[PDB]
Paper text:
P. stutzeri WM88 has PtxABC, HtxBCDE and PhnCDE ABC-transporters for the acquisition of phosphite, hypophosphite and organophosphonates, respectively. These transport systems rely on a high-affinity periplasmic binding protein (PBP) to impart ligand specificity. HtxB is a typical type-II PBP, with a binding pocket positioned in a deep groove between two domains separated by a hinge region. A comparison of the HtxB and PtxB structures showed that sequence differences within the binding pocket essentially eliminate an oxygen binding site in HtxB, providing specificity for a ligand with two oxygen atoms (hypophosphite), over one with three (phosphite).
In the HtxB complex with phosphite, the phosphorus centre of the ligand and the four tetrahedral atoms surrounding it (3 oxygen and 1 hydrogen) occupy approximately the same positions as the equivalent atoms in the hypophosphite complex (2 oxygen and 2 hydrogen). The two common oxygen atom positions between the phosphite and hypophosphite make equivalent interactions with residues in the binding pocket, namely the sidechain and mainchain amide of T129, S130, the sidechain hydroxyl of Y97 and the structural water molecule (HOH). The pocket is capped by a tryptophan sidechain (W52) that makes a P-H…π interaction with the R1 hydrogen atom of the phosphite (distance of 2.7 Å and angle of approximately 140°), forming a similar interaction to that present in the hypophosphite complex. However, the additional oxygen atom of the phosphite, to which it is equivalent, points towards the D206/R178 salt bridge to one side of the HtxB binding pocket. This phosphite-oxygen atom is 2.8 Å away from the oxygen atom of D206 and 3.2 Å away from the nitrogen atom of R178, suggesting that both residues interact with this phosphite-oxygen, albeit with a rather long hydrogen bond to the arginine. Although we could not directly observed the position of the hydrogen atoms in the structure, at pH 5 it is likely that the majority of the phosphite in solution is mono-anionic (pKa 1.3, 6.7), carrying a single proton on one of the three oxygen atoms. The 2.8 Å distance between the phosphite-oxygen and D206 implies, therefore, that the phosphite is protonated at this position and acts as a hydrogen bond donor to D206. These additional hydrogen bonds appear to provide enough stabilising energy to trap a fully closed complex in the crystal structure, which is virtually identical to the conformation observed in the complex with hypophosphite (RMSD Cα: 0.25 Å). We have shown that HtxB is capable of binding phosphite at pH 5 due to a change in the protonation state of the ligand that facilitates the formation of extra hydrogen bonds within the binding pocket of the protein, enabling the formation of a closed complex. Although this complex can be captured by crystallisation with a large excess of phosphite (5 mM), the Kd of HtxB for phosphite at pH 5 is only 1.74 mM, which is ca. 1000 × less than hypophosphite at the same pH.
Residue numbers in the entry: 7 to 63, 64C, 65 to 157, 158C, 159 to 242, 242A, 242B, 243 to 262
The structure:
Amino acid sequence: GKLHLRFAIAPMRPTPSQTIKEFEPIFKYLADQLGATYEIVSPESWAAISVAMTNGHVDVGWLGPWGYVLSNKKAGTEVLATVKYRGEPFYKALIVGRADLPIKKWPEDAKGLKLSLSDQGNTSGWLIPMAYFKSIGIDPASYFEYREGATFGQNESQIQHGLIDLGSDMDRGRNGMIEAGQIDPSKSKIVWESSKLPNDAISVPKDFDPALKARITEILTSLSEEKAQSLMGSGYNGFVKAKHSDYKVIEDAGRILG
Ligand SMILES: [Mg+2]
């Protein structure tokens, strides 16, 4: 009678090893509160963690917003809580450019430039920038010299080294890379920033044990900002109780894109 939990976390940092090193402590804390043993993985892409949850491989997953919406539609995955960054359950999508890129008439002056978006399960990296371009009648695949599937770490590296012109990122991710000395911010600039988006979703499978679900929610949402920050990467400092309707803006964007 030894309780065991399978954990997964999305690409919070540029590599899976950095993500696990910095964020495992919150999962270890959660398991210890329950007297559970555990295992943990961090897939390379935002799509991959959504798929792992949908296919029955994960008990408690830290999914991105679009990854949660997709898994809920396909398998009935439930959101229990939303992560806080700087005390708020929100964040912004970015399009970043080379520092010397002419942008005074953006994006009408950008035809044929090299643009890299992320995997199709990535909210800020793919869904939101695609929705932006469609809202102004631009098809990125024909308008730009276009690539899809890159990680946020790859986008920022390639911009800094002059291999692409433009790439997607999220504000909380870019901040962490600057803070860790992984980006020289003098070599890039923010070209576009979205409106506020709901943050990542702490998620469980459909019909996960009801008693355990309630306990998990209480353990995470009762944490002080100081204690939460001591267990996670810089800026991540708590959890708030959440439900499906908190993700409406993401569901709406997905539906409009088809
Ligand atoms: Mg507590």
